[PDB]
Amino acid sequence: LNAPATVCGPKLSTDLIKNQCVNFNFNGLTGTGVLTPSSKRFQPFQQFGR
């Protein structure tokens, strides 16, 4: 995951649930939190922020 993922295992995908405490899973990157629209400018080789 230094780039977009391409070889991913067989898992199903659901919809976005914004402004609510959920459990997320974005390409194997798990966690728990809320999701809101953001105003950051990702250059087209970056997948995530730190």
């Binding site: 780039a3 950051k40 250059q43 995530f48 922020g49 730190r50």
Partner: peptide, 30 residues
């Protein structure tokens, strides 16, 4: 001839968005 490379040849270290930070890293730099 020889010249000097004044503050040239810095590149992005990895593929992670960062903003308003100072970041200390070790790599192969000019």
């Amino acid at each position: 001839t020889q010249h000097t490379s004044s503050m040239r040849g810095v590149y992005y270290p990895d593929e992670i968005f960062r903003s308003d930070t100072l970041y200390l890293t070790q790599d192969l730099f000019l």
